[PDB]
């Protein structure tokens, strides 16, 4: 009956850091996908296992919208079977991923003159994330033989690093807002459908 709140996701004023990526569940609503695929405001719109224009004749039990900010250089990591600092340690899509990855340039919002340091990414992690795993811990990472005990120093590094978005960066270094749509098919009654 009611319309799915995509505007809350795509037109949100503030976005999460990629290490603390934000998930919103979308349920019990009619999804107007024409608002997204008929928009000229995205630079990346990649769907896996489903067609964007052919999405309103499908039903799902749940839709999940994950959103965060990353470098332009790193949008290529938000895809099945990717590696790199983001895919390994921040946001990991599964190989059998079904859904869509949407991204637009947000240099107009997320860069500051002296550099915007509000956005961080995880640099140090002992192992890779499982698909859709989320790590927001801030434990001092022990890179050497001797233990750190919470004290930053040599071989003892804070695991999060700041992006520092300045407006004059090249495109690869400019901030991009990313929205990942996941389409969940359970053997349970559907709650999200298109017109």
């Amino acid at each position, epitope marked *: 009956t009611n319309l799915c709140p995509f505007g809350e996701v795509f037109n949100a004023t503030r976005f999460a850091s990629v290490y603390a990526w934000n998930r919103k569940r979308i349920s019990n609503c009619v999804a107007d996908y024409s608002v997204l695929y008929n928009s000229a405001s995205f630079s990346t719109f990649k769907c896996y296992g489903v067609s964007p224009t052919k999405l309103n004749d499908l039903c799902f039990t749940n839709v999940y919208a994950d959103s965060f900010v990353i470098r332009g250089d790193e949008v290529r990591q938000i895809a099945p079977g990717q*590696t790199g600092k983001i895919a390994d340690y921040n946001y990991k899509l599964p190989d059998d991923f079904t859904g869509c990855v949407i991204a637009w340039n947000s240099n107009n919002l997320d860069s500051k003159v002296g550099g915007n340091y509000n956005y961080l990414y995880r640099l*140090f992690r*002992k192992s890779n994330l499982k698909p859709f795993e989320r790590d927001i811990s801030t434990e001092i990472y022990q*890179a*050497g033989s001797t233990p750190c005990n919470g004290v930053e120093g040599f*071989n003892c*590094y804070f695991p999060l*690093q700041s992006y520092g978005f*300045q407006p004059t*960066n090249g495109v690869g270094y400019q901030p991009y807002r990313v929205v990942v749509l996941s389409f969940e098919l359970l053997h349970a009654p559907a709650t999200v459908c298109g017109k």
Partner: antibody, heavy 117, light 108 residues
Framework: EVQLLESGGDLIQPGGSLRLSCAAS????????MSWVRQAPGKGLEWVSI???????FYADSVKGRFTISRDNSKNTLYLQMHSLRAEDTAVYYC???????????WGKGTTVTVSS | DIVMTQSPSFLSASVGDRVTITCRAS??????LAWYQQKPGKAPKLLIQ???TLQSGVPSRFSGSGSGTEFTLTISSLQPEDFATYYC?????????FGQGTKVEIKR
């Protein structure tokens, strides 16, 4: 107390194979970004390969599909396996710890690889 | 692809002189630059990271500055033992790109 000791360089004929080793102390190979960097006689620095702490590996175009970087956690040692070696692979090979952004603060003394008939 | 041009390729300066080496990036790389010193027959030595942070164990006469596309390595009082080749490196890149290097000779 931190050192990177490397070995394995030798004279090798074109198309042959060779494995370089880099024994670490003070740094935990498996916890760090570890790179191999090579330098031809009289030329600049060329990055070759890297292994992330999580295990992901990456290679420069000129070696992609021929070199394989790996590590042995029990021995705290970095490896560079080379196959189908070419004359342009002749260089001094260094191992280095990458602080995370590409900046390498710890280097080994280097090992020399000569690819000739 | 981002290119790092380093200038000059060679420079000669007298002991005590203030020396400045420039590294230019083909587009804005923020502060993502490192500087290295390689003396002949030695591995390179990390001098500066993040454009301006003096690495621990480098004499304070070495100093870096710069943001965006133009970065400088300054040796404020050239010493005979500062004979070396100096390299810049674009950081936080898929490519791990080095500059061509600047050879610094002592003029005596």
């Amino acid at each position: 107390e931190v050192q990177l000791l490397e070995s394995g360089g030798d004279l090798i004929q074109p198309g042959g194979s060779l494995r370089l080793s880099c024994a670490a102390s003070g740094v935990t190979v498996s916890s760090n970004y570890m790179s191999w960097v090579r330098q031809a006689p009289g030329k600049g620095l060329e990055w070759v390969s890297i292994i992330y702490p999580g295990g992901s590996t990456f290679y420069a175009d000129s070696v992609k599909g021929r070199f394989t970087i790996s590590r042995d956690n029990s021995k705290n040692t970095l490896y560079l396996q080379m196959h189908s070696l070419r004359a342009e692979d002749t260089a001094v090979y260094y191992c280095a710890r990458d602080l995370g952004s590409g900046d390498m603060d710890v280097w080994g003394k280097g090992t020399t690889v000569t690819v000739s008939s | 692809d981002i290119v790092m041009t380093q200038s000059p390729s060679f420079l000669s300066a007298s002991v005590g002189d203030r020396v400045t080496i420039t590294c230019r990036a083909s587009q804005g790389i923020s502060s993502y630059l490192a500087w290295y010193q390689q003396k002949p027959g030695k591995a390179p030595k990390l001098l500066i990271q993040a454009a301006s942070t003096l690495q621990s164990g480098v004499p304070s006469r070495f100093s870096g500055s710069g943001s965006g596309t133009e970065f400088t390595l300054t040796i404020s009082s050239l010493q005979p033992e500062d004979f070396a080749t100096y390299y810049c490196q674009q950081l936080n890149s898929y490519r791990y790109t080095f500059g061509q290097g600047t050879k610094v000779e002592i003029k005596r």
